[PDB]
């Protein structure tokens, strides 16, 4: 049964540095863009909406526009990879990725900023 896993559910990061939190999802041989839904959120803010290969930038929260970034190269590898450039203190909190690829599951990652 489709299950999402995370390598790290706590990330401790320095303020102002870059970070990449990851959610691993089962992919087999090839990736079907037309079947993948990926969602990234933290607390009460939208970060990423990427639905069957279409990313809607209008729904992304303003505090993440121009800093928040989903590395689609890794998607072929079964990795939902969120990249936030120049992290702030406000970037600390509970993050959540949501993947649909056949089945559907989510996991949570705590991000702490020194």
């Amino acid at each position: 049964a489709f299950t999402v896993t995370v390598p790290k559910d706590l990330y401790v990061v320095e303020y102002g540095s870059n970070m990449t939190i990851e959610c691993k999802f089962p992919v087999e041989k090839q990736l079907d863009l037309a079947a993948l839904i990926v969602y990234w959120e933290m607390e009460d803010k939208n970060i990423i909406q990427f639905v069957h290969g279409e990313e809607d930038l209008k729904v992304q929260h303003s505090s993440y526009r121009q800093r928040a970034r989903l590395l689609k190269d890794q998607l072929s590898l079964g990795n939902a990879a969120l990249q936030i450039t120049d992290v702030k203190l406000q970037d600390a909190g509970v993050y959540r990725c949501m993947i649909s690829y056949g089945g559907a599951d989510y996991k949570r990652i705590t991000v702490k900023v020194n």
Binding site: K45, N46, V59, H61, A104
Partner: peptide, 17 residues
């Protein structure tokens, strides 16, 4: 539920706008 996820992102984005 991916359909539920779309509804929450739509509501929250609409609120921020």
């Amino acid at each position: 539920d991916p359909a539920l996820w779309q509804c929450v992102f739509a509501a929250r984005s609409c609120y921020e706008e």
